[PDB]
Amino acid sequence: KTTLFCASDAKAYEKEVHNVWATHACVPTDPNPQEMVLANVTENFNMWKNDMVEQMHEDIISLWDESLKPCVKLTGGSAITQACPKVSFDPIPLHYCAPAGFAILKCNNKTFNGTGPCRNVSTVQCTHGIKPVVSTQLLLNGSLAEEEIIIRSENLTNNAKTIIVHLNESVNIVCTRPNNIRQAHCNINESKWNNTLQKVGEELAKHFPSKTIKFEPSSGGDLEITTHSFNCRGEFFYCNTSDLFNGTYRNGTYNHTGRSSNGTITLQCKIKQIINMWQEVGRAIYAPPIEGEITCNSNITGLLLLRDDTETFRPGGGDMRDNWRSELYKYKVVE
C-alpha cells in the first residue's frame, strides 16, 4: 500500500471535464517507459484484493464529483441543490504511477486470470492508458485479450461473485438519440454477437462440465444494473439488453433467441435524470437532455456476468471497482 499519483496527456485548454480535472490532479505523462523485464519470479496476484482499485475508485469519484454536478443530490433524506450546467464529457486515459522508491510489477502471461501464480513478469513506474468508463453489464473502451477471451472470478463457484469476461475481438455498439425527447436506441451487429457468445459459451463450458449454458437478462433491481447503463456526452443512457444477453449454448453451438432485424440488434434506450449513484448511496437529479443528435460510438471490450444440469448467466455490474479491475486485472505495487 502506498499513495499513488495519476499521469495523463490532459491539455489545459480543453473545457472537457476529464481534462479540467486531470490538469489539476494528475501529472504530465513522461516519455520515460522502462519496463523492467524479468524471468526469475513467482509473484502471486489477486485482482480481487488490491488497493489500486480503491484509490482509482476514490479519485474517479472526485472527478465525477467536481465535473458532472447534478441539479439535486438526495442523500440520507437530505436534498442538496446546486447549478446544473451541461458540460463537455469524454473519458481520457489515466496512468497510475507509484512514487519515489516504490515500483509497479507487471504480469505478462497472456492467459493469466487475476488470482494466482504468475511469472513472466516485468515492472514499471507508471501504468498503461486507462479510461474511467462508467458502465454496467458492458465494459467499454478497455484492453483486449492478446490471445483468447478469458474468464475472471474471485471464485467461479460463488454464484454471487461477479464474473468479469475479458474479450478479444471488440464489439462496436452505436448508441444514439435522434435530432420522445428521452427515447434513444443502440445498434449492434448480430453476427459478431453470436460469434462472441460462442467464445464466452465454449470457455464457460470448459469451466462448467457438460451442461446447457443459458444466457438471460438480469433478474431484478434498479435500472442501473438491470440495463446497460452508461454515460454519453453527459447524458445518462439506460439501454435494454433483453434481446441481447439471450441465448442457449448446447452441443458446442450457441443459438441466439433474442429478436433481430436486417442482421442487426436494436436496444431500446431511455435517457434518465434521476440516477441511483455509483459513488455513494443516494440519488442524483440532472437537467433534461441537451438538444440535437446525441450519439456514442463505443466498443465492447468485456462483459459483467452473474451465475445462479443447466446453468444460466446474467449481465451484472453496479460496483464500478470491478469495472476498474477489468483494466487493473493488474500489475502489482511493490517495494
Next chain:
Amino acid sequence: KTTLFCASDAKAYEKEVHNVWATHACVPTDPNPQEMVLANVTENFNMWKNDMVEQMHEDIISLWDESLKPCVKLTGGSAITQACPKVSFDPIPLHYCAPAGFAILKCNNKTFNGTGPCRNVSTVQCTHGIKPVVSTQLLLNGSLAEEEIIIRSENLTNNAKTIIVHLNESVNIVCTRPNNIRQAHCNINESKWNNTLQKVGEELAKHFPSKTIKFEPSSGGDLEITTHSFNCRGEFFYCNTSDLFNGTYRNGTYNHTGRSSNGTITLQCKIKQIINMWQEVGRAIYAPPIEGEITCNSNITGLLLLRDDTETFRPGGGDMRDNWRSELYKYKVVE
C-alpha cells in the same frame, strides 16, 4: 477531379504513428453518415482508373515517409542517412471524404466487378473505414464479399494484368518471431486454405472454361513480390509462400500439394533490414529487429494473382494502389 480529405478515429494521445499522422492530417470522423440510396441510376465504374486510389496512395506514402524513417535511404546512387528509432505501428481505418458540394456515390451490387455498369447505387460523403495495410500476395484486414468470392481484373485475358481475388470467409494467419533473431514463421489452418482455394478454383474455372487450374509460387525477381511481404509492428516480414500457393484444381475439386504438418501450414519467414521501396524506386535500410516476441495475428481477406491444357496462377503484388483498389473497388467522386 477533386482533392479529398481523410476522416478517422485517431487519438492525439497515442504514440502510434498512424494516429500521430492522422491527427494532424485527417479530420475527426463523422458519425452522421446517412447513405441516401437511389434506384433509378445505372452508372459505370472503373476501379482500375480512379484517382481516389492515387490520392490515398500519395497520402499513405506521406504517412510512411513521416513515420517509418529508415537508417539509410539509397536512391539513384545517392544515400541519405537519418535517425531510425523503432516506433509503434498498427494501421487504423481511414475514411476518404469529398469536400464541399462534391459527393461520393456508391455501389451496392455486391456481385459487382469493379468495371462496368451498376444500378443499385447509394451516395455518401465519406467512405467506410480502410486500414492502409501494405502487403504483397495476400491482402490483409480488408472487407469481405458479403455473398460469394469475386474475381476482379482490368482485364482477365491479359496475363500481365494483376487479378484481385476478393474473398468471402477470412483466413486467419499468425506470423510470429519467438523470444536466429531474424528468423520467424507464419501459421495457417490448412482445411480453411483448401476450402478457400476450391472456390477461388471453381470461379477461376467459371471464367476459364474447361482448363486444369494450377496454383504455383511466383516467377522470381525481388523478394517483396516473390514472398508474402508485410509490416508487423514496424518490422518488415518476408514470408515464404511455396507451400501455400500450391495446388491443382481439376474435375471440380481442388487438390493441395503444398506441404503441411498436424493439419497446419507453416511459412518460413525472415525479417529483413534491406527493403526495396514500394513508395519510390530505391532501397531502405532499417535498424535490426526489436527484442522479444513479435506477433501479428491477421485475417486474409483477399488474394493478388497473375496468370501466365492448363492455366497457372501465381501470387502477385508489388504495386500498392492495387492494394487500395481492393477496398476501393469502389464508389465514385461525382457531382
